[PDB]
Each structure stands twice: as structure tokens, then as C-alpha cells.
Design an enzyme around this catalytic site. Structure first.
Site, short mmCIF file in Angstrom:
data_model
loop_
_atom_site.label_atom_id
_atom_site.label_comp_id
_atom_site.label_asym_id
_atom_site.label_seq_id
_atom_site.Cartn_x
_atom_site.Cartn_y
_atom_site.Cartn_z
N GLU A 96 0.86 -1.18 0.00
CA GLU A 96 0.00 0.00 0.00
C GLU A 96 0.90 1.23 0.00
OE1 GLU A 96 -1.01 2.15 2.83
OE2 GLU A 96 0.39 1.35 4.34
N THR A 156 3.10 -8.09 4.76
CA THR A 156 4.10 -7.80 3.73
C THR A 156 5.51 -8.11 4.24
OG1 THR A 156 2.71 -6.05 2.78
CG2 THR A 156 5.05 -6.03 2.23
N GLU A 207 32.55 -11.27 5.31
CA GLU A 207 33.23 -11.31 6.60
C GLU A 207 32.25 -11.32 7.76
OE1 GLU A 207 36.64 -8.61 6.94
OE2 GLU A 207 36.70 -8.88 9.12
N1 LIG Z 1 10.33 -0.57 15.23
C1 LIG Z 1 9.34 -0.37 14.37
N2 LIG Z 1 8.38 -1.35 14.20
C2 LIG Z 1 7.36 -1.15 13.33
C3 LIG Z 1 7.27 0.02 12.58
N3 LIG Z 1 6.16 -0.08 11.81
C4 LIG Z 1 5.57 -1.28 12.04
N4 LIG Z 1 6.31 -1.94 12.99
C5 LIG Z 1 6.10 -3.28 13.59
O1 LIG Z 1 5.87 -4.21 12.56
C6 LIG Z 1 4.77 -5.04 12.88
C7 LIG Z 1 3.64 -4.74 11.92
O2 LIG Z 1 4.13 -4.95 10.63
P1 LIG Z 1 4.09 -3.84 9.47
O3 LIG Z 1 5.51 -3.51 9.07
O4 LIG Z 1 3.34 -2.60 9.90
O5 LIG Z 1 3.24 -4.61 8.33
P2 LIG Z 1 3.51 -4.58 6.74
O6 LIG Z 1 4.92 -5.02 6.41
O7 LIG Z 1 3.18 -3.26 6.09
O8 LIG Z 1 2.47 -5.67 6.15
P3 LIG Z 1 0.91 -5.28 5.91
O9 LIG Z 1 0.61 -3.88 6.36
O10 LIG Z 1 0.05 -6.25 6.68
O11 LIG Z 1 0.62 -5.39 4.43
C8 LIG Z 1 4.35 -4.72 14.30
O12 LIG Z 1 5.04 -5.66 15.05
C9 LIG Z 1 4.89 -3.32 14.51
O13 LIG Z 1 5.25 -3.08 15.85
C10 LIG Z 1 8.24 1.00 12.74
O14 LIG Z 1 8.18 2.05 12.10
N5 LIG Z 1 9.26 0.81 13.65
MG LIG Z 2 1.35 -2.25 5.95
#
Ligand SMILES: Nc1nc2c(ncn2[C@@H]2O[C@H](COP(=O)(O)OP(=O)(O)OP(=O)(O)O)[C@@H](O)[C@H]2O)c(=O)[nH]1
Ligand SMILES: [Mg+2]
Ligand SMILES: Nc1nc2c(ncn2[C@@H]2O[C@H](COP(=O)(O)OP(=O)(O)O)[C@@H](O)[C@H]2O)c(=O)[nH]1
Ligand SMILES: COc1ccc(/N=N/c2cc(OC)c(OC)c(OC)c2)cc1O
Ligand SMILES: [Ca+2]
EC number: 3.6.5.-
Lengths: 437, 426, 155
Positions: A71, A145, A254
Site C-alpha cells: 500500500e 508484507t 566477513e
Molecule cells: N520498530 C518499528 N516497528 C514497526 C514500525 N512499523 C511497524 N512496525 C512493527 O511491525 C509489525 C507490523 O508490521 P508492518 O511492518 O506494519 O506490516 P507490513 O509489512 O506493512 O504488512 P501489511 O501492512 O500487513 O501489508 C508490528 O510488530 C509493529 O510493531 C516502525 O516504524 N518501527
Molecule cells: Mg502495511
């Protein structure tokens, strides 16, 4: 000079990638428009920062990075932010419908509609390389994702780039700031499917970074900004050796030689010190022995676990700033004996040390104070099996009742993929147990 | 995931659907004519989710109005927001249904389904990023229940990957003493178990008890009940209409709230309870999980929570929400299933509803909902055992086996809730 | 057979026709395939005038069908309060039990006919009457959380 390509997948990987590349530009002296005044070789160069930045004829330094998400919301923030003019417009690839926190939607149904474009755009960055050594992949364990598309991407990368290294920066799910109840399922599913295609993976436990923000930075309710600022600071310390002159971990190969004794146990633990709030701008400077000592304190680890429990298989100390070599050897000498630090009988009970004599850079608006010297320890300990035991338990609870499983089966996935993934995990925990604990 | 298509069927469907557009439109600063009189840029962020931009810097609600009874046309049209709807989105029949689920689903309503699908295609074709549908109706009548479920099944055939969401008002003799409504409700539940992704159970028995015993309404009116409804439809949809952490995705809600496909019937709750002309974080949180604050006549202390969502609204301490929420889960740990870790999701929203400065909405998937279904099944069985009025239904083509199959399907549903209420991980 | 037309006449509420068929010897206590008399049907479809006329012409107010339903069972279920009292005025057995063990009190409680409940109690309805599953009128009130019903049965 050998190039590295960084791939950021899903919201987690994209937002953390945005913070890292900001920091990269500050450490190297690159303006948000890409101009590097201190670069006397316009249009190209063999310098160590060129492993991460290519150069145009007009003197523009463009990260060798690709951003992918199903998205467009999060990537749209990257196309309108400060560093909007830094990235290639065509290396920011977005879909229309995301994987609904569903591993199967990211790997089978939805992800399948953009994987070919992602490869072509990656292949465009590789053709500009004279000696590409591999890829750095930023993704979450718990997103549809981050987990499902990423496994699919890794599989494709081993086919078209069979000789190149693939390193991982993975976000481990923490309930304090989680998004989905099925995040344990996605974590297990992507691990099992990416395990044989990943050479080395640095897991970041959102719970560890969350607590560090609350204790050391006195942040009551840490957000994704606060979290990512600190992750970018630690990521910077792991990839510094690839971007600067040095003698420890100078190339991707490495990383494996020093940290991964066996292919399946490629999950090093990262510890960083010191973290000091910018509100304490006049702090007393910690000594080389003080920051060194803090690398063996569980409270500073990037993954919550107790290295006292397990055995060490390899340890690397990466220092930055005012650090005299003889002061490190003295710190190692005492801490070698002044604590129960046990190596395995079959490994050279040593420490690898590289020193970068420039202090860390801090970004304007961050939560950290400037320090004269810092250190990031990368170690492979059997104690990180504890993190896996926590995931697999939460997995087992839901899968016993088959909770949420229909969501996976309705999106191309077959129910047998859950069991073989969980067995693969069960084997991983016994891989660490056959080493010792 | 962006646009949603609203559909309201039958007297109850349009009666509560109209109030929905009156309430949310007031929150988004959309006057009856459709002009944005709001003073905040947040009122327009997720505006396209429920509205269309038809030039003139205006917003036409993406709604479709249906009813076999032409009388509902006048009521909605002559309402305070009856002209902000599309004249083209009015599908009304000449013949009512007369509390006959069969006339709406097999004869009368069937002949009127193709025309409804027309206006449904017109709206979806013009959607840049359509995510799903939402239907408001009752289950006791004949149009919204009998015809509304048939239209649900048709739409799902053409849009099989979109999300189908329903706000289903459950029949109660306290509000309408009609003995054929357990038939209609049971026949509809049989459909809803298969052809919808999320169903909000809005129980007339609970709405009557809230007004009568709590709101002090000796003779509650459909306006009194719909007030509690309208406020609940606004709370449950808050995150779809304004910025916030709970993203804005009907499919991510369904992924996190529905652990088993047939168990997609949600028990809503709202706090505080208010009248029509007439508390800190600890109260809201506590009161949210109180049986007196549930929109379905069931006691959550009688079962276990599978999953739960909580939408907080208004200016309030965010860390205070994490503390008190974490507290009720521990003090009430016996009422949550241990085999679904972190089964409680919380999020705050800035803009609260009019008249209120801080509210909370509770959306729970709870095994205690079987009590609602046990009620309807008993009344269905009392009537079916005597074959009372079965000829009203068989006379339209239905086979007697549909009642039995419908009755068996619901007893199984109850057995399913009971199975995960006694399921233990230890 | 005039018995067949009197059943339909009562089912559809044809008062004038009910009177005509009786003048020609129609069996007021005829039944259909399931055992329903004209008084059963008049009580079900709430034809108060046909009920009073049948009772003045030899109709058995306590007839049961094959399932054991008396006219007062069906009137209590369907919720015809006027007809319930007329049937009670003519010696209908308030505690008649059908083949499911249900009495008139049970059906009124289940369907929520709170007025009819109060009338049956005031005529001697047995609150300790259990059905085939041990349920009594009060038990039904407790299992369904009907506070209104429970208070009426406690009085
Ligand atoms: N540290 C950190 N964790 C994040 C962040 N954004 C999302 N997360 C973590 O990632 C997980 C959620 O996955 P997302 O990365 O939001 O999901 P995505 O990869 O976009 O996959 P979909 O939205 O379902 O299509 C949760 O455990 C969140 O806490 C971020 O900006 N920083
Ligand atoms: Mg997402
Ligand atoms: N909460 C609520 N319930 C209603 C309203 N109007 C009707 N109902 C209920 O809906 C049922 C009747 O169904 P109805 O919609 O009128 O039949 P339809 O015209 O075929 O859809 C009865 O059980 C009523 O109690 C209303 O305005 N609010
Ligand atoms: C058991 O744990 C969970 C339960 C529910 C969760 N999310 N719930 C929502 C609720 C929404 O509106 C009510 C959304 O608005 C439509 C919504 O869009 C993203 C998500 C998340 C959970 O991790
Ligand atoms: Ca150069």
C-alpha cells in the site's frame, strides 16, 4: 569497493530505512538533495561510501536502496519528506492493497502481483554495479508484507543472485506496540521459509528498544519515531565497517566468517552503549571500560534474553570515537575473568576488535545526546534461543485450537505449511541446544 | 482499502441507516445540503470512505436505499437529511413484505433484487479503491431480513473478495410482540453465518432494557432505541472515518477479530449511557465491560472473550489508557481465553462525538453471545413445534426443511461458542 | 363434508359462514388431519367472535390435537389475550400439558406475552409445572435473563 543494495519491505522496513538513510547522509556529509561537497571525484569513485551511494554525472549521491510496500501510504511519506529528492523515483514501488497482516496474502496472492516489477527494478540497480556483493533487507516479522512478501523476495533473490550475500534486519514483534494478533504465525512462517536463503540476520526486538527508550531516555510512551531513531543508530554501527575504512567486517562475506559458525544459527545479538537522553547534555563521559562493561548487561541488548544462560560462539566489538586500543585490551582482560562469560569448547575464545575514531553522529530532533565514544558488540550466543522459545509458545497456543488458520488457507496457503514450519522451528531450538546452554 | 458502499433495507434498516448519516455527517462537518462547515482538516482525511465528491466541493453519501414498502420513501425523504441522498439510489417497491421472510427472499424481494444490484454496480464502478459493503437492517421483519440476506448473497457472488459487513437488529417481544419474528430471525441467521464477514448484533431486548431500566424510559420509543444505535455505529466506525493508529481497514479488523469463520457475530458496547436531551478513563474502561453497557442482551461474565477491540475517543492521557486497560484484563483474566495471547487491541481517537467530550466503544467477540442465540432458538422451537403459521411461508415456495436446517445450523453455532468457552490451554 | 368447510371458515375468520354451516348440522367438533378442531383454529388466528359462538354451540374447549395442544395452548402461544380469558371463562384447563410437557404458562413465558402470564397466574397456573427437560415457567425466566418475567412470576 564492492556495492551493497538495501531493500526495505513493508511499513516497518520502510520507516526504519528512512531513518537509517537520513543518518547515513549525516555521517558521510551528504545533503538531502544528494550533493557531497567533500567529494572531489565527481561522477564516480572507488571510496568506501560508494558501496552505499552511487553517483551521477552532475554530482548527485543516490542511495542504492529500494522501497517496496503493498500500500502507498507509508512510502508516500517518503516521497514528500525531507529526503524526497535523494532516492530514485522508480526505486519507491507501491501496490494498492496490502497483505491484511496475513502472511499468505503477502507471499501467494497479493505479493505475486508485484514481485516481477520489484526484481526488474532491483536488477536495474545491480547493472550499475561493478562488483555487487549482496543485499541488506529490512522487514518486520509480524506484518503480512514484511513476512510474506519478504520470504518470496528472498526466494527469488537466491535464484537470480546465487553467489551474493543476503543479510537481514528483522523486527521481532512486541505486544506493547503490536498490530495484529496473528503476528506470531507470520513470524514462524517467514523464518522457516527464509532460513535457507539468509546468510545472517540481526533481529530487533521491539520490546527491547521500547524499554530502552523508557528507562534510558525517560520516554513515558515510546512511539515509532523514538524506536526507529535508536534502531537507525544501531543499524548505523553494524554497517559502518562496510561504509568506512577499517579492518573488521569489511565486506558481507566477513559477517558470516566472524559471526556464523554454522548456516542455520545466523542470528547474532546486538548490544549498544551508551544510550543517554539529550536532556543530559552535560553528562560525564563514560570510559572505554564503562561502555565495554555495559555490552554484557542484558538491559542494553537489542533482543531480550540472558547471555549468562548460553555460551558464546563469537564476539565482535565495533568502537566509534575517542578510543585508545590499549584501553580496549585492558577492558577485555578484566571483563574476561570478572564475569561468567563462557565460550564453547570448539571456538577460539577470543574477541574481535575494530575501532573507528570518529564519534557517532546524532540527527537533529533525536532523543540521544552526543558521546565521545560508543561501542556495538555483535555476538552469537545460544541465549537468543530464548527469543525463539517465546515466539513458538505463542504460536503453539493459537495453532492448537487452529485459531485464525482459515484466513491463511483461503489465500492460497495449505494448512500443512503450518506444521512443517513449526517443526523447522523445533529443530532450530535444538540446534542451539546441541551447541550448549 | 478505501471506499465503502452503504446499503439500508426495510423500515428498520432505513430508520437506523438514516440516523447513521445524520450523526457521522455532523461529525465530519457536512451540513444537510452537503457543504463542509467543519473547522478542522481532520474532518476530511478519510472522508472519501463514506462520501463521494460530486463537484461543487460537496459530498454525496455513498448509500443505497431499498424497501418493498413505498412508505419508507416519504419518511427518509422528508427527514432532515433526506435530500442529501441520491435520487438515483432509491429502490422502493409497491408491495410490502408483511413480516414474511419468504416474500422478501423468494418472491416479492427477489423480483426487486436485480434493480438493487444496478445501483450497487453504479457505485462500485465509480470507486477508486472499494474495500467492502455495510448493510443495516432488522432480522425480525421480511424485507431487511428476507430480502436483505438475498441481496447479501448476490453481491458476494460478484464481489467475492470484498468485505461484507452488517448491522443486524435482533428481534425482541419487548419492543415488537410479533410471533413470526423468531422465524425470520432464525432464517436470516442461517444466511448470515455463511455470507458475511462481520456482523454487529444490535439487540432490541438490550436496547429496551437500557432505556427502561437505566435511561428511565417507562415507554421507550424507536427514537430512544435508535439513539443508542446511532451512537454505537459511530463509535465502531470511528477509525474508518478519522486518522489514528487502528488503521482504517475492514479486512485487518476481520483478520484480528474473527478466529473462526462462523464466529463473526460481534457484541457492541458503549459508554457512557446518555438519553436524548441530557467520567474519567477508569470509568469508561470499567463501564465498557459492564453488562448494562452492552448492545446485546447477554452477560459477558457468563462466557469468555475470544477477541476484543476498544475505541477510545477524546482528549485523554494515552498512558492512562494503557494502564487501566491492562488492569481490567488482569482483574478479569478469567473472562478471556488464554490460548489467544494479546487478544485485546486498544486505540484512541482525537475527535469525540457531539455532546460528549470522552467516550469509549467496545467491540467484543464473546462466547456469551450464545445466550442471544439461545433466546431466539427457544422461541423458534416453541412456534415450529406447533407448526404455527408455517403456511404463510410454504405458500411462497419454501420447503419445510429450511426451517429445520436453519434450526440445526443455529444449535450448532451455540454448540460452537460453548466449545471454545470450555476449551482450555491450562 | 360440512366439517371441512367449518374448519376453513374458522381459519379464515368467516363469521357469517360459520353461522350458516352450523344451522345445517356442521360438526362443530370436527378435526383436521392433525387433530385441530375449528376452536383450535379460531384460537390460533385470533378470531374472537368465532370462538365465542363455537363455545355456545357445543365446542369442546379442552379438545387436544395429536400433539396434545388444547385451544388454550395455542391462544397462549400466539398471544391472544382476549381469547385466553374467554377460553378460561368456559372451563379451559389452565394447567393442560401437551406432549412436550408444556403448559399454557410455559408458552406465554417463552414468547414474552407478559399480560397473558399475569392472567394465567390469577387463574391458578401451576408455577411448579416442569416440561420434559425439567424447566418451569420460572426456570425459563432465569435462563433467559428476563427480569420483567421473573418479577411477575415471583410477585
Ligand atoms: N520498530 C518499528 N516497528 C514497526 C514500525 N512499523 C511497524 N512496525 C512493527 O511491525 C509489525 C507490523 O508490521 P508492518 O511492518 O506494519 O506490516 P507490513 O509489512 O506493512 O504488512 P501489511 O501492512 O500487513 O501489508 C508490528 O510488530 C509493529 O510493531 C516502525 O516504524 N518501527
Ligand atoms: Mg502495511
Ligand atoms: N432498533 C430499532 N428496531 C426497529 C426499528 N424499526 C423496526 N425495528 C425492528 O425491526 C423488526 C421489524 O422489521 P422491519 O424492518 O420493520 O420489517 P421490514 O420492513 O421487512 O424490513 C421489529 O422487530 C422491530 O422491533 C427502529 O427504528 N429501531
Ligand atoms: C486481537 O487483537 C486485535 C483485535 C483487533 C484489532 N484491530 N481492530 C481494528 C478495529 C477497527 O475498527 C473497529 C479497525 O478499523 C476498521 C481496524 O482497522 C485497521 C482494526 C487488532 C488486534 O491486534
Ligand atoms: Ca566521487
Amino acid at each position: 569497493m564492492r556495492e551493497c543494495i538495501s531493500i526495505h519491505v513493508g511499513q516497518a522496513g520502510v520507516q526504519i530505512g528512512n531513518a537509517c538513510w537520513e543518518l547515513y547522509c549525516l555521517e558521510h556529509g551528504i545533503q538531502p538533495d544528494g550533493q557531497m561537497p567533500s567529494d572531489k571525484t565527481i561522477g564516480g569513485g572507488d571510496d568506501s561510501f560508494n558501496t552505499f551511494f552511487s553517483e551521477t554525472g552532475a554530482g548527485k549521491h543516490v542511495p542504492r536502496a529500494v522501497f517496496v510496500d503493498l500500500e502507498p501510504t507509508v512510502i508516500d511519506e517518503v516521497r514528500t519528506g525531507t529526503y524526497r529528492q535523494l532516492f530514485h523515483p522508480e526505486q519507491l514501488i507501491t501496490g494498492k492493497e496490502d497483505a491484511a497482516n496475513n502472511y499468505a496474502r503477502g507471499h501467494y496472492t497479493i505479493g505475486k502481483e508485484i514481485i516481477d516489477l520489484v526484481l526488474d527494478r532491483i536488477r536495474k540497480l545491480a547493472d550499475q554495479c561493478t562488483g555487487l556483493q549482496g543485499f541488506l533487507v529490512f522487514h518486520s516479522f509480524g506484518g503480512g508484507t514484511g513476512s510474506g512478501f519478504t520470504s518470496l523476495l528472498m526466494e527469488r533473490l537466491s535464484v537470480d543472485y546465487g553467489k551474493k550475500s543476503k543479510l537481514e534486519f528483522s523486527i521481532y514483534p512486541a505486544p506493547q506496540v503490536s498490530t495484529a494478533v496473528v503476528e506470531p504465525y507470520n513470524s514462524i512462517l517467514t523464518t522457516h521459509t527464509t532460513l535457507e536463503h539468509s546468510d545472517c540476520a540481526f533481529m530487533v526486538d521491539n520490546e527491547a528498544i521500547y524499554d530502552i527508550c523508557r528507562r534510558n531516555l525517560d520516554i513515558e510512551r515510546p512511539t515509532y519515531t523514538n524506536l526507529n531513531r535508536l534502531i537507525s543508530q544501531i543499524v548505523s554501527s553494524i554497517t559502518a565497517s562496510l561504509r568506512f575504512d577499517g579492518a573488521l567486517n569489511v565486506d558481507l562475506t566477513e559477517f558470516q566468517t566472524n559471526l556464523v559458525p554454522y548456516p542455520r544459527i545466523h542470528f547474532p545479538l546486538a548490544t549498544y552503549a551508551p544510550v543517554i537522553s539529550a536532556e543530559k547534555a552535560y553528562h560525564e563521559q563514560l570510559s572505554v571500560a564503562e561502555i565495554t562493561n555495559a555490552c554484557f548487561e542484558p538491559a542494553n541488548q537489542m533482543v531480550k534474553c540472558d547471555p549468562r544462560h548460553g555460551k558464546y560462539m563469537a564476539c565482535c566489538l565495533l568502537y566509534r570515537g575517542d578510543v585508545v586500543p590499549k584501553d580496549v585490551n585492558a577492558a577485555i582482560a578484566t571483563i574476561k575473568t570478572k564475569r561468567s562469560i563462557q565460550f564453547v569448547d570448539w571456538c577460539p575464545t577470543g574477541f574481535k576488535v575494530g575501532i573507528n575514531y570518529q564519534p557517532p553522529t546524532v540527527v537533529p530532533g533525536g532523543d540521544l545526546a552526543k558521546v565521545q565514544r560508543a561501542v556495538c558488540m555483535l555476538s552469537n550466543t545460544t541465549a537468543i534461543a530464548e527469543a525463539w522459545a517465546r515466539l513458538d509458545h505463542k504460536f503453539d497456543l493459537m495453532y492448537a485450537k487452529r485459531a485464525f488458520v482459515h484466513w491463511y488457507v483461503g489465500e492460497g496457503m495449505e494448512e500443512g505449511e503450518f506444521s512443517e514450519a513449526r517443526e523447522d522451528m523445533a529443530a532450530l531450538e535444538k540446534d542451539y541446544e546441541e551447541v550448549g546452554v | 482499502m478505501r471506499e465503502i458502499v452503504h446499503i439500508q433495507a426495510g423500515q428498520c434498516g432505513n430508520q437506523i441507516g438514516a440516523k447513521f448519516w445524520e450523526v457521522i455527517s455532523d461529525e465530519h462537518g457536512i451540513d444537510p445540503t452537503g457543504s463542509y462547515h467543519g473547522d478542522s482538516d481532520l474532518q476530511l482525511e478519510r472522508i472519501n470512505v463514506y462520501y463521494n465528491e460530486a463537484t461543487g466541493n460537496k459530498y454525496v453519501p455513498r448509500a443505497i436505499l431499498v424497501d418493498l414498502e413505498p412508505g419508507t420513501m416519504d419518511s427518509v425523504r422528508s427527514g432532515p437529511f433526506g435530500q442529501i441522498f441520491r435520487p438515483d439510489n432509491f429502490v422502493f417497491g409497491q408491495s410490502g413484505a408483511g413480516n414474511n421472510w419468504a416474500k422478501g427472499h423468494y418472491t416479492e424481494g427477489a423480483e426487486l433484487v436485480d434493480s438493487v444490484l444496478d445501483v450497487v454496480r453504479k457505485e462500485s464502478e465509480s470507486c477508486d479503491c472499494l474495500q467492502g459493503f455495510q448493510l443495516t437492517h432488522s432480522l425480525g421483519g421480511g424485507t431487511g431480513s428476507g430480502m436483505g440476506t438475498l441481496l447479501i448473497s448476490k453481491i458476494r457472488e460478484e464481489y467475492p473478495d470484498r468485505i461484507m459487513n452488517t448491522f443486524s437488529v435482533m428481534p425482541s417481544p419487548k419492543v415488537s410482540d410479533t410471533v413470526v419474528e423468531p422465524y425470520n430471525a432464525t432464517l436470516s441467521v442461517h444466511q448470515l453465518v455463511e455470507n458475511t464477514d462481520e456482523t454487529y448484533c444490535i439487540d432490541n431486548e438490550a436496547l429496551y432494557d437500557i432505556c427502561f431500566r437505566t435511561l428511565k424510559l417507562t415507554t421507550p420509543t424507536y427514537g430512544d432505541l435508535n439513539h443508542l444505535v446511532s451512537a454505537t455505529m459511530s463509535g465502531v466506525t470511528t477509525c474508518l472515518r478519522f486518522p489514528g493508529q487502528l488503521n482504517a481497514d475492514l479486512r485487518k479488523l476481520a483478520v484480528n477479530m474473527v478466529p473462526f469463520p462462523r464466529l463473526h457475530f460481534f457484541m457492541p458496547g458503549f459508554a457512557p449511557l446518555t438519553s436524548r436531551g441530557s467520567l474519567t478513563v477508569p470509568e469508561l474502561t470499567q463501564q465498557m465491560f459492564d453488562s448494562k453497557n452492552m448492545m446485546a442482551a447477554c452477560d459477558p461474565r457468563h462466557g469468555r472473550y475470544l477477541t476484543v477491540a476498544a475505541i477510545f475517543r477524546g482528549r485523554m492521557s494515552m498512558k492512562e489508557v494503557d494502564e487501566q486497560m491492562l488492569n481490567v484484563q488482569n482483574k478479569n483474566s478469567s473472562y478471556f481465553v488464554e490460548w489467544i495471547p494479546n487478544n485485546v487491541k486498544t486505540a484512541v481517537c482525537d475527535i469525540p462525538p457531539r455532546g460528549l467530550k470522552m467516550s469509549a466503544t467496545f467491540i467484543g467477540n464473546s462466547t456469551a453471545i450464545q445466550e442471544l442465540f439461545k433466546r431466539i432458538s427457544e422461541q423458534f422451537t416453541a412456534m415450529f413445534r406447533r407448526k404455527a403459521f408455517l403456511h404463510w411461508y410454504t405458500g411462497e415456495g419454501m420447503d419445510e426443511m429450511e426451517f429445520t436446517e436453519a434450526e440445526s445450523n443455529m444449535n450448532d453455532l451455540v454448540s460452537e461458542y460453548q466449545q471454545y468457552q470450555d476449551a482450555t490451554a491450562d | 363434508d360440512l366439517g371441512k368447510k367449518l374448519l376453513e371458515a374458522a381459519r379464515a375468520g368467516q363469521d357469517d359462514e360459520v353461522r350458516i354451516l352450523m344451522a345445517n348440522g356442521a360438526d362443530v367438533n370436527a378435526t383436521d388431519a392433525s387433530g385441530l378442531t375449528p376452536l383450535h383454529l379460531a384460537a390460533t388466528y385470533g378470531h374472537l367472535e368465532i370462538v365465542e359462538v363455537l363455545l355456545k354451540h357445543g365446542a369442546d374447549v379442552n379438545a387436544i390435537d395429536i400433539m396434545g395442544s388444547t385451544p388454550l395452548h395455542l391462544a397462549a402461544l400466539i398471544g391472544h389475550l382476549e381469547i385466553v380469558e374467554v377460553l378460561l371463562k368456559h372451563g379451559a384447563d389452565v394447567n393442560a400439558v401437551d406432549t412436550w410437557g408444556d403448559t399454557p404458562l410455559h408458552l406465554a413465558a417463552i414468547m414474552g406475552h407478559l399480560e397473558i402470564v399475569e392472567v394465567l397466574l390469577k387463574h391458578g397456573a401451576d408455577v411448579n409445572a416442569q416440561d420434559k427437560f425439567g424447566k418451569t415457567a420460572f426456570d425459563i425466566s432465569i435462563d433467559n435473563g428476563n427480569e420483567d418475567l421473573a418479577e411477575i412470576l415471583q410477585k
